[PDB]
């Protein structure tokens, strides 16, 4: 029994869609077209949606080392290792499943997603995207600590499971193909090749029809005709970069997606406690930050007079301690309280 | 009991009449049936059953 | 064109407003307040209900001394009674004549009824005023639902409506309120952990799902009767049961200005207090130019029947000479007289019939049909 | 409550050799426009048979993003606060 | 207030409850004419 073999990818397929920059600023019908970039995760993780499907082979089988993309009319297999994500510099890919990629990217103004096909030909899609993720906590750090202050943050979970979030899907539109038509001496010959072809000619007689068998259009030229293969057996993401199917109305399905956004915990480092010296209603701190650290302070009376500054390097701070008291917060550390003697 | 729709009939979402291998047998018909139940609360029960293939000509 | 008027905050009274855009035929709009809702923001402090005195089987320690331990339970009471000799149907329960002890224990918790029968203590603050207004606009009745703050713009058939701000900020609700089913009460209820025995709040639960509850029921365990197995006790009766009979009439019956009180959510409906400003931004297309509207001449008015009352007890027949066929607005130029009809169809040398309301015994009023005025003389009877 | 919005844009209705029609849909920020004189291309050539008289119906609406359950801000009306106090009392050599 | 939110500002999208099906939206969403021979839905909208 294979009663637990539910595979949504048997119904869906990778596709070709519009990309404004396929390299060198020129637009193309991309097999790695960018659909949507999600940046709701406060931890800085990007949830990227593309036209291809990662971790799935053409036979619908799941294989993490493989990737499937639309090659002209038919989907083809490609290596997962060849897949790359970049902004101003390369990104760290944290998870891949179907149309979705999880990536940790450096600061940038564009977002590029690419891969290398079977023929060793590189394909990429560039979209303008301002990426500069906000700071988690009060300290701008580079690497993730094992221990630190536990702060609330959101991330896209690395779980391959699809249970909460979803996308709209529908049948793809008719796929135009000029190779279906040929010039039989001085007429039009439409060869279906075991497919359902929708044809239309700028000639008399039986000029149109949804055919399953070969058709001939006598007293007609090849340029006067339009031929397209219909796709009623497959599903495709409801993409605004692909036209809607003309035959069916507002017909649509829905499928669950991997990596949903969830509330988690982010560990942040606590900046080293500064060298503190005292004076009459005055506190002097010698700040030695290892990275940008936020310093904030307020009076504990009627007039708090809240002040804040990002401390980048070695700086001596002179603060007035009123009779009511002074509260000082240095980065992710718990607030220090000062009172006059 | 969660109910789904197929033309002029109602059926249990987890049990479509096309089972087993709904998609393998009739891919167009299966997708059309799923599209007709997109607004139904038991859509994901129907999606699970329709896109699962455990054929007769198999040991396991 | 923005038309601004002020109507009294009274529900069920149709008001006529004359819109006069310069160079455009007059427009009569009928406005009626269908409902005025004052919904306060609620913050649940606690819920109260009937308490349950949980008394298990007493521990009768035969030939020994039982020991009471401090249990963190609401109104926990424990007492060990010495020199007991209890009897059951088949004789004495204990082998020993003397040295037998009975440990009596009890605690208070929410009754099984607390999910069904309960009163909620809420902190009520700054109510948001909302209004439902019926407008007779272009021969059709339109409904406008907007917050009466003078900021919430609601557009219906291209006409932008700005309702309020209310002239009166009055509310029938105090800072602290108590809700029981469909009834609301103004009550300075005791805070959580301050409830008194036999009074509202003897038992207090922060939420209806809360496991731990506050209890002050004056529960005191008594010595059992000679040779009897039972747990006698003294306790102040249910404060919630007492409040249910002592609450008096709810806000629906006691509130001034004829307030109607509803629950789910808690709100004051149709409180007849102050006035309500109305702003209507009527679109360009709704208006008809004076030249495009019929011109009326040779106007005369006759009143064959009149009774001075609150309703339309007056009848007036107005004769006219119209230049062309079309719709004309009907309006009273005297504030002491009001006309039922807002718009009538005119055609050449014909007559129109209108219904009017007045309190005057001798009513002398002017009626403006389109852009022409006509004097009406009426002797109205009681 | 407020959160990040989602602009829902389905596949555009490209009506080949015809004129598409926009209808008023009761959806938040519903936008609909029919563009005339379109001639769109796919990888294998032109999508429409006709050179002229092809229309594209573009439609969009706004709804809550998938993030709204996790990432959100709540707008509250705050009134008359109840003051509470936790007090330590050294009573009979013990802290209560 | 609800139904008074401005584009690109706090309240551009307003939902009475987190479970609410219908929401208020004022994001200044304007659809644009697609590029020559291109299938896409270009638009202008005030950011979140």
The SS3 call for residue B24 is: helix
Answer yes or no: do A8 and B47 touch at CB < 8 A.
yes
* Smallest CA–CA distance from D39 into chain E, residue: E37
Answer yes or no: do A252 and B35 touch at CB < 8 A.
yes
Residue C231 is encoded by which pair of tokens? 């747990």
Task: Please give the Cα distance from C240 to C74 (Å, whole number).
Answer: 17
Q: Does E17 reach chain C within 8 Å, measured CB to CB? A: no
Long-range CB contact pairs, A69-72, < 8 A, 24+: A69/A14, A69/A31, A69/A32, A69/A115, A69/A117, A69/A123, A70/A13, A70/A14, A70/A15, A70/A16, A70/A31, A71/A31, A71/A117, A71/A118, A72/D43, A72/D44
Task: Please give the Cα distance from A83 to A124 (Å, whole number).
Answer: 10
| Distances in whole angstroms, Cα of residue A143 to Cα of each of A146, A156, A269 | 10, 19, 10
State in Å, rounded, how far the first CA of chain C is from the last one: 42
Nearest to A197, CA basis, from A164, A224, A226 = A226
Task: Please give the Cα distance from D49 to D34 (Å, whole number).
Answer: 19
Q: Mark whether E and A touch (3+ CB pairs within 8 Å).
A: yes
Task: Please give the Cα distance from C270 to E15 (Å, whole number).
Answer: 27
E-contacting residues of C 127-156, CB under 8 Å?
147, 149, 151-154
With a CB cutoff of 8 Å and minimum separation 6, the contacts of C291 are none
Provide, as residue numbers in chain D, all residues whose Cβ is less than 8 Å from the Cβ of A168. 10
Nearest to A276, CA basis, from A318, A322, A314, A339 = A318
**Which resolution, in Å, applies to this structure?**
6.8
Provide, as residue numbers in chain C, all residues whose Cβ is less than 8 Å from the Cβ of E3. 152, 154
Task: Please give the Cα distance from C313 to C381 (Å, whole number).
Answer: 9
The SS3 call for residue C192 is: coil
| Burial of E46 from C-beta contacts in 10 A (0-12 / 13-18 / 19+) | middle
Write down which chains contact chain E via at least 3 CB pairs under 8 A: A, C, D
* Contact yes or no for A28/A250 (Cβ under 8 A): no
Query: What is the length of chain C?
Result: 382
Nearest to A11, CA basis, from C125, C84, B51 = B51
- How wide is the angle at C-alpha C364 spanned by C-alphas C359 and C367, nearest 5°? 100
Q: Does D82 reach chain C within 8 Å, measured CB to CB? A: yes
Q: Which residues of C126-154 are buried (b: 16+ CB within 10 A; e: fewer)?
A: ebbbbbbbbbbbeeeeeebbbbbbbebeb
Task: Please give the Cα distance from C223 to C246 (Å, whole number).
Answer: 33
Answer yes or no: do A10 and B23 touch at CB < 8 A.
yes
Task: Please give the Cα distance from C272 to A93 (Å, whole number).
Answer: 66
Task: Please give the Cα distance from C206 to C183 (Å, whole number).
Answer: 20
Helix then strand count (H, E) for chain E reads 0, 4
The SS3 call for residue A52 is: strand
Residue A154 pairs in a beta bridge with: A263
Provide, as residue numbers in chain E, all residues whose Cβ is less than 8 Å from the Cβ of C149. 1
Residue C293 is encoded by which pair of tokens? 């509207």
* DSSP string for D31-93: EEEEEES---EETTEES-S-SSS-EEEEEEEEEE-GGGGTSEE-------PPP------EETT
Task: Please give the Cα distance from D40 to C371 (Å, whole number).
Answer: 58
Answer yes or no: do A27 and E38 touch at CB < 8 A.
yes
* Contact yes or no for C259/C271 (Cβ under 8 A): yes
Answer yes or no: do E40 and A241 touch at CB < 8 A.
yes
> After which residues does chain E become discontinuous at a C–N distance over 2.5 Å?
none
Task: Please give the Cα distance from A125 to A22 (Å, whole number).
Answer: 5
The SS3 call for residue C270 is: coil
Give the CA count within 13 Å in the CB-facing half-sphere of C64.
7
> Which sign, positive or negative, has the C-alpha torsion C9, C11, C13, C15?
positive
Give the other-Cβ count within 10 Å of A178's Cβ.
15
Long-range CB contact pairs, D18-26, < 8 A, 24+: D18/D53, D18/D54, D18/D55, D19/D53, D19/D55, D20/D55, D20/D56, D20/D57, D21/D57, D22/D57, D22/D59, D25/D59, D25/D61
Q: Where are the alpha helices (DSSP H) in C143-246?
A: 239-246
Residue A316 is encoded by which pair of tokens? 């001596």
Q: How far is C331 from chain D (nearest CA, A)?
A: 37
Residue C41 is encoded by which pair of tokens? 């923001």
Task: Please give the Cα distance from A121 to E41 (Å, whole number).
Answer: 29
* Smallest CA–CA distance from E4 into chain C, residue: C152
| Burial of A258 from C-beta contacts in 10 A (0-12 / 13-18 / 19+) | buried
Provide, as residue numbers in chain D, all residues whose Cβ is less than 8 Å from the Cβ of E13. 2-5, 28, 62, 64
Task: Please give the Cα distance from C328 to C25 (Å, whole number).
Answer: 8
Residue A96 is encoded by which pair of tokens? 């891949």
| Burial of C256 from C-beta contacts in 10 A (0-12 / 13-18 / 19+) | exposed
- How wide is the angle at C-alpha A286 spanned by C-alphas A281 and A290, nearest 5°? 145
* Contact yes or no for A28/A70 (Cβ under 8 A): no
Answer yes or no: do B34 and A232 touch at CB < 8 A.
no
* Contact yes or no for A2/B54 (Cβ under 8 A): yes
The SS3 call for residue C294 is: coil
Nearest to D70, CA basis, from A320, C373, A261 = A261
Task: Please give the Cα distance from A268 to A151 (Å, whole number).
Answer: 7
* Contact yes or no for C29/C195 (Cβ under 8 A): no
Q: Name the one residue in this structure whose structure tokens are 């331990």.
A: C69
State phi, psi for B6 to the nearest 5 degrees. Answer: -140, 105
Largest CA distance in chain C: 120
Answer yes or no: do B48 and A6 touch at CB < 8 A.
yes
Residue C91 pairs in a beta bridge with: C88
Task: Please give the Cα distance from C16 to C10 (Å, whole number).
Answer: 14
Q: Name the one residue in this structure whose structure tokens are 């948001």.
A: C128
Task: Please give the Cα distance from D70 to D72 (Å, whole number).
Answer: 6
* Smallest CA–CA distance from E2 into chain C, residue: C152
DSSP 8-state assignment for residue B23:
H
- How wide is the angle at C-alpha A140 spanned by C-alphas A138 and A141, nearest 5°? 120
Residue A319 pairs in a beta bridge with: A283
Answer yes or no: do D64 and E31 touch at CB < 8 A.
no
Q: Name the one residue in this structure whose structure tokens are 């002040």.
A: A307
Q: How far is C142 from chain E (nearest CA, A)?
A: 20
- How wide is the angle at C-alpha C182 spanned by C-alphas C177 and C188, nearest 5°? 15
């Amino acid at each position: 029994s294979t009663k637990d073999n539910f595979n949504v990818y048997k119904a869906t397929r990778p596709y070709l869609a519009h990309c404004p920059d396929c390299g060198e600023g020129h637009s193309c019908h991309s097999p790695v077209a960018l659909e949507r970039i999600r940046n709701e995760a406060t931890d800085g993780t990007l949830k990227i949606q593309v036209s291809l499907q990662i971790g799935i082979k053409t036979d619908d089988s799941h294989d993490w080392t493989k990737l499937r993309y639309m090659d002209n009319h038919m989907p083809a297999d490609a290596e997962r290792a060849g897949l790359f994500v970049r902004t101003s510099a390369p990104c760290t890919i944290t998870g891949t499943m179907g149309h979705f990629i999880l990536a940790r990217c450096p600061k940038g103004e564009t977002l590029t997603v690419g891969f290398t096909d079977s023929r060793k030909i590189s394909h990429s899609c560039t979209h303008p995207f301002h990426h500069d993720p906000p700071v988690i906590g009060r300290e701008k750090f580079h690497s993730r600590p094992q221990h630190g202050k536990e702060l609330p943050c959101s991330t896209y979970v690395q779980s391959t499971a699809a249970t909460t979030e979803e996308i709209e899907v529908h049948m793809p539109p008719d796929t135009p193909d000029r190779t279906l038509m040929s010039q039989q001496s001085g007429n039009v010959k439409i060869t279906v090749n075991g497919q359902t072809v929708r044809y239309k000619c700028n000639c008399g007689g039986s000029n149109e029809g949804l055919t399953t068998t070969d058709k001939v259009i006598n007293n007609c030229k090849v340029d006067q005709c339009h031929a397209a293969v219909t796709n009623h057996k497959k599903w495709q993401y409801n993409s605004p970069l692909v036209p809607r199917n003309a035959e069916l109305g507002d017909r649509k399905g829905k499928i669950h997606i991997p990596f949903p956004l969830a509330n988690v915990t982010c560990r942040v480092p606590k900046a080293r406690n500064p060298t503190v010296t005292y004076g009459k209603n005055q506190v002097i701190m010698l700040l030695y930050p290892d990275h940008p650290t936020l310093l904030s302070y307020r009076n504990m009376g009627e007039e708090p007079n809240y002040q804040e500054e990002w401390v980048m390097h070695k700086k001596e701070v002179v603060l007035t301690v009123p009779t009511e008291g002074l509260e000082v917060t240095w980065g992710n550390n718990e607030p220090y309280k000062y009172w006059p003697q | 009991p969660v109910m789904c729709l197929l033309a002029n009939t109602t059926f249990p979402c987890s049990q479509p009449p096309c089972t087993p291998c709904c998609y393998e047998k009739e891919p167009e018909e299966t997708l059309r049936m799923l599209e007709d139940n997109v607004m139904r609360p038991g859509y994901y029960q129907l999606l699970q059953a329709s896109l699962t293939c455990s054929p007769h000509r198999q040991r396991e | 064109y923005e038309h601004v008027t002020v109507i009294p905050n009274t529900v069920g009274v149709p008001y006529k407003t004359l819109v006069n855009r310069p160079g455009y035929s007059p427009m009569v709009l009928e406005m009626e307040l269908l409902s005025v809702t004052l919904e306060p923001t609620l913050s649940l402090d606690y819920i109260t209900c009937e308490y349950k005195t949980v008394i298990p089987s007493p521990y009768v320690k035969c030939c020994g001394t039982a020991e009471c331990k401090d249990k963190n339970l609401p109104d926990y009471s424990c007492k060990v009674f010495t020199g007991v000799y209890p009897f059951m149907w088949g004789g004495a329960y204990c082998f020993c004549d003397a040295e037998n002890t009975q440990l009596s224990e009890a605690h208070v918790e929410k009754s099984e009824s607390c999910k069904t029968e309960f009163a909620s203590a809420y902190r009520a603050h700054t109510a948001s005023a909302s209004a439902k207004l019926r407008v007779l606009y272009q021969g059709n009745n339109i409904t406008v639902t907007a917050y009466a703050n003078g900021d919430h713009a609601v557009t219906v058939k291209d006409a932008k409506f700005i309702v309020g701000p209310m002239s009166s900020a009055w509310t029938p609700f105090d800072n602290k309120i108590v809700v029981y089913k469909g009834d609301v009460y103004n009550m300075d209820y005791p805070p959580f952990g301050a409830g008194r025995p036999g009074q509202f709040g003897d038992i207090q639960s922060r939420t209806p799902e809360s496991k731990d509850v506050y209890a002050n029921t004056q529960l005191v365990l008594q010595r059992p009767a000679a040779g009897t197995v039972h747990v006698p006790y003294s306790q102040a009766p249910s404060g919630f049961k007492y409040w249910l009979k002592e609450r008096g009439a709810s806000l629906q019956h006691t509130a001034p200005f004829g307030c109607q009180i509803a629950t789910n959510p808690v709100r004051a409906v149709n409180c007849a207090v102050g006035n309500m400003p109305i702003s209507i931004d009527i679109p360009e297309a709704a208006f008809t130019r004076v030249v495009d509207a019929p011109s009326l001449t040779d106007m005369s008015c006759e009143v064959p029947a009149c009774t001075h009352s609150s309703d339309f007890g007056g009848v007036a027949i107005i004769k006219y000479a119209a230049s062309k066929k079309g719709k004309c607005a009907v309006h009273s130029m005297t504030n002491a007289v009001t006309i039922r009809e807002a718009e009538i169809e005119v055609e050449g040398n014909s007559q129109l019939q209108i219904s009017f309301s007045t309190a005057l015994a001798s009513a002398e009023f002017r009626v403006q049909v389109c852009s022409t005025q006509v004097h009406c003389a009426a002797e109205c009877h009681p």
